[PDB]
Structures are given as structure tokens and as C-alpha cells.
Amino acid sequence: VPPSLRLPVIEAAFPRQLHPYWPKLQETTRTWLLEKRLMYTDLMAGYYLGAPDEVLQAIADYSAWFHVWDDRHDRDIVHGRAGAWRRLRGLLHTALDSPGDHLHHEDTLVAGFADSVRRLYAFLPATWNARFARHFHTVIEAYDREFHNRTRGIVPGVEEYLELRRLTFAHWIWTDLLEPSSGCELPDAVRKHPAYRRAALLSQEFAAWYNDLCSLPKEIAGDEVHNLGISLITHHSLTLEEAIGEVRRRVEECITEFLAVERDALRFADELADGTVRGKELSGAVRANVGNMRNWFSSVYWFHHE
């Protein structure tokens, strides 16, 4: 790992995990992408540990779709296809709420989205489905804001980018998907516990900001506008080396902040195991989810260097 990207705490204290379904996952996702005419799963295989095979497969197919969507988004941006993007944006909002209606849409990107969403909706009650949808409507609109910014060459401010990135990276989607992976929709009072919330946040901030750190030199050279380091360079008059340093410090702080709040979240899980069956189940679900929040760190880190 190139020294500027090396994180000794990850290497020393976040040992990699791999879901045993990983060999079939890749090829099955490939088949799905081919069946859907849409054309990395190791990232998901090192993250949602303990997920039922069917849940991991649905998540990996969604991730692959997400990557294809990101490519289409990039292409509409650099070609200035405002109409095609607007129409796609509208169709994804509609398919998100009514995926069955869009399973055979003429736009294969929309039909693939609708199938992956339909499948993710088959694991937990409708209240989880509704929360997933609320979050992903927000992700689509954040992608529209990124379209605006990049087509106009606007570099968001630092705080502006941090808030936008929690949405374009889909922080709350990956957090939602913790729950079908451990087989339990968590009550609001559990998943909004400040330790759970903060652990979930820091896991995603680390993934997003580490991606920015690894991509900054490439993206500054390409004259791009959406990267934490680019916001720092543009609006704080940092050199590239200073910006690399600052992003790296923010990433390292995510890790040690996570260690503290993980300890709090696991103590909360202990408190949920109150001697009842439901309490034991909630406790096990929180423990599994927090462990996968931990797994996200190592999965993203080593994904970048493979």
C-alpha cells in the first residue's frame, strides 16, 4: 500500500472477513448483469457477513446495478444529456415505489433497477421497504445535484460536499441493508440509539472519504469537481499535498472515533439482551450489524489495493 494511503490501524486491528458464498456471488452477479443486458461483489462479500446467501446475492446485484448507474450518470454528465438524465431520474423515482410495473421497461437500466429493488423488498416488512425507498429517493436527488454541479463545473464547499456525499455515497442505504443481512428490521428506538447511529455514520464516512483520498490525484488531473480534497484545494487554498494530509487525517479520525462508539454500541447490545427471547434477538442483530459496520472498513481498504 503506497505510504500516503496506508492505514496501520486498519491493517493491525481490522482483520479482513469473507462470506463463504463469495465464489458463487461473483459469477451469479455476472449472469444477472448479462440477463438484464446491463453490461466488485468481493466488496459486498467482505461487508455483509452472516447474510443469507439470497440476501447477499440481492445486495451484490444491487451494487453492480449501482455501478452501472454511476457509469450512465457520468456519461450523461460529460455529454450534457440533461434530458436523458432528467427522464432516467424520473423513471428511477417511479420504479423505486412501483418496481413490479418497471420489470420490463425498455430502458434496461430501469428494468434492472426494478428487479434488484423488487428482490430487496422481499426480505423484511413493508416499513423497512418504505424506509429504503425514502432513503433512495434522496440518493437520486443527490445524484441530480451532482449532475448540476459537474455540468456547470461548480466545486461545492467543504461542508456542502460532506453533506451531499452522505447522500451520493448512499450511506443510509448500506446502513439499511445491514438489517436484511442479519434477518431483523430494527425498531426506531434501537437503530436511532446514538451509539448505533454514530457507528453507522462513521463506517460510511470512512468508506467515502477513503475513496476520495485514493482518487484525488486522478480526479484533480481530470479537472473533476466532486471530491473532499478538491473542495479543500478550491475553497481552503490547500496544495495537493496539504489536501492529501487533511483528508488522510479525517479518515484516521473516523477509525478511532469508530472504536470508541463501537464499544458503546456493543454495550447497548449487551443491555438489549435482557433475558428475554426478543431481547436476545435484538441484541444479536445489533451485534451483527455493528460487526459489519466494522467489516466495511477493512473491505473498502483492501478493495482499493486489489
Write the layout of secondary structure elements.
Blueprint lengths: L7 H6 L8 H14 L5 H5 L7 H27 L2 H16 L10 H13 L5 H26 L6 H11 L2 H12 L5 H4 L2 H28 L6 H9 L3 H33 L4 H28 L2
Helix pairs in contact: 2-4, 4-6, 4-7, 5-6, 5-7, 7-8, 7-9, 9-11, 9-14, 11-13, 11-14, 12-13, 13-14
PDB class: lyase
Keywords: Terpene, Terpenoid, Terpene cyclase, Terpene synthase, lyase
Assembly: monomeric
Structural commentary:
With 306 residues, the chain is mostly helical. It has one domain. The protein has 14 helices and no strands. It has helices at residues 8-13, 22-35, 41-45, 53-79, 82-97, 108-120, 126-151, 158-168, 171-182, 188-191, 194-221, 228-236, 240-272, 277-304.
Number of domains: 1
* Content of β-strand: under 5%
Order of helices and strands: HHHHHHHHHHHHHH
How would a crystallographer describe the biggest sheet? none
Number of strands: 0
Motif (DDXXD motif): 70-74
GO molecular function, one term: metal ion binding
Organism: Streptomyces coelicolor (strain ATCC BAA-471 / A3(2) / M145)
Catalytic activity: (2E,6E)-farnesyl diphosphate = (+)-epi-isozizaene + diphosphate
